[PDB]
Ligand SMILES: CC(=O)CSCCNC(=O)CCNC(=O)[C@H](O)C(C)(C)COP(=O)(O)OP(=O)(O)OC[C@H]1O[C@@H](n2cnc3c(N)ncnc32)[C@H](O)[C@@H]1OP(=O)(O)O
């Protein structure tokens with residue numbers, strides 16, 4: 001459920017979705033929220049402060065303790081079957097963040113498309129750190145306390161090591177990324193949710209990654 | 212504290228304090244042991260499964276620990292150890308042991324497991340099995356230190372603020388820091404009290420020299 | 421506030437807000453000054469000992485600071501500096517200073533002390549004595565930055581998110597980030613307002629270029 005103030009906000013949250021202990025605050029005009037079926041979005045605080053903002057959460061998404069701040073003309077899209085523990089998402093500068101299907105974001109994530117303040121080059125006075133969209137691909141696992149900064153695109157089927165800060169995009173899927181700066185530390189892997197399988201062949205969710 | 216199951220044994224001696232702490236035990240044939248003169252406050256401790264062993268020796272002070280133990284796991288914290296806020300997770304039937312007279316600053320994360328599997332595409336095998344963590348006697352973890360699976364810390368070691376350990380170390384009496392974690396100083400001993408000018412003023416340090 | 425001891429002085433301007441902030445001073449000869457138009461809110465500030473100094477100039481905004489000062493220590497924060505949630509600890513009779521118009525994001529941990537001694541086996545002597553921290557003018561600390569003892573930060577520097585500083589830098593007008601912390605960008609100046617087109621549009625930045 002939610003607290004909505006302004007003109008022509010559209011909030012459509014499926015009746016099959018649970019929103020226990022969550023604060024959804026929409027302050028402004030022409031904002032739109034869609035939450036799909038069989039979601040569990042609990043103990044969160046989602047704030048849309050501005051105009052023309054979009055939040056889209058697909059089916060079967062489970063979120064616990066997300067603190068999310070969206071400003072005018074920004075967009076957050078989270079695709080189906082993604083799960084997220086406690087963390088923070090911040091979108092400004094009329095930008096966007098997208099998180100793919102069947103991602104797994106462990107406690108302590110911080111994801112942002114913006115530094116929130118300008119840096120200028122002394123060579124010409126011009127701003128050099130404009131906001132840039134973040135794209136997290138399908139089936140990405142962010143370990144604990146991962147930080148994803150502006151402009152970063154993460155390929156499909158990637159694991160990001162605990163405590164890693166990503167400043168730059170990667171192109172290689174099926175790898176583990178860790179260190180500073182962040183780099184590929186292992187290639188040719190696939191991760192899964194349940195650790196009771198002899199091999200990957202026992203997890204029917206993984207077939208697409210190896211077939 | 213909250214118990215659902217049979218043949219669970221819980222001995223929390225008095226002389227020891229558990230103010231504002233939640234203990235939940237779901238399962239059977241589990242054992243919780245907290246020694247004398249311990250301080251276990253504002254913590255949330257969960258045991259779920261069977262034949263789990265939680266052992267906290269005498270003279271232990273823990274404030275704000277979140278601890279999760281799964282079936283057939285064991286956590287052992289030896290005497291004199293002090294701990295601030297942090298997290299310990301044990302799974303995959305493994306164990307974590309923390310030696311005597313350790314000093315763990317706020318922010319610690321200790322676990323023997325990733326909680327999820329990573330397989331090789333090359334042979335389909337899981338490659339990140341859980342492994343025991345052994346933290347030696349008289350270890351100081353600075354703020355926000357992360358100790359991951361399979362790591363063994365020698366006796367009398369300082370780990371620098373915000374360091375993450377992925378690998379074991381063999382050298383005692385050292386300071387460890389950086390990324391990757393590295394020995395950055397050798398032949399030291401730490402103590403708890405700044406007012407002790409020299410290691411000779413601190414009777415607790417006799418054994419390390 | 422709560423104050424115990426003799427010759428303790430506490431001057432908090434009438435024009436400053438201290439909502440939800442607890443201030444505790446225990447000892448003798450301690451001095452607290454908070455200047456005009458400050459907002460020092462939801463903070464926990466403790467002075468315990470003798471001859472301690474807390475100086476916070478005009479137009480400083482602080483939210484969620486946990487600050488601990490021991491005997492003969494001093495903390496000085498100059499005008500127009502803003503600080504989110506964080507921790508500052510000063511012991512061993514040392515000093516921390518934060519210059520004018522700094523911007524510290526939530527999560528800072530700043531200390532001049534390790535709080536616990538490390539001794540050399542060779543001679544039994546303590547070898548991690550506390551050292552003073554100096555953060556220059558117009559320093560921006562990104563989220564969750566840690567500044568350890570002895571560190572001096574030059575004027576007009578940005579420190580990147582989750583960076584740990586364990587040693588001093590001398591280059592101004594740069595961005596420092598990574599582990600180990602290093603200069604990753606030179607010849608810059610940061611400002612507060614994303615709405616501005618260029619550095620020239622922000623009159624507070626005039627003193628840093630030309
Ligand atoms: C209950 C409690 O446990 C409360 S205590 C928590 C509050 N205190 C802390 O977390 C302690 C903060 N201090 C530190 O982490 C210190 O680095 C510790 C671990 C205490 C060690 O201090 P010291 O023995 O004084 O050595 P320190 O100068 O820090 O570093 C030794 C070398 O290791 C380097 N180093 C330190 N941190 C580094 C890093 N992060 N990356 C790379 N190098 C690093 C230093 O630059 C130095 O190099 P050199 O001088 O030999 O060329």
Ligand SMILES: CC(=O)CSCCNC(=O)CCNC(=O)[C@H](O)C(C)(C)COP(=O)(O)OP(=O)(O)OC[C@H]1O[C@@H](n2cnc3c(N)ncnc32)[C@H](O)[C@@H]1OP(=O)(O)O
Nearest residue numbers: 115116119129167181523524525562563580581597598604
């Ligand atoms: C203070 C307040 O009141 C509120 S602020 C709190 C919210 N905002 C934040 O925490 C800011 C988050 N942003 C950052 O940390 C950014 O990195 C900052 C520090 C702002 C810098 O932004 P920019 O000037 O755009 O730097 P950027 O180009 O991304 O720097 C990348 C360069 O420096 C490297 N780099 C950046 N961070 C790095 C890192 N951690 N490790 C290694 N390299 C790093 C990049 O790989 C790249 O190198 P190259 O391309 O020159 O070879």
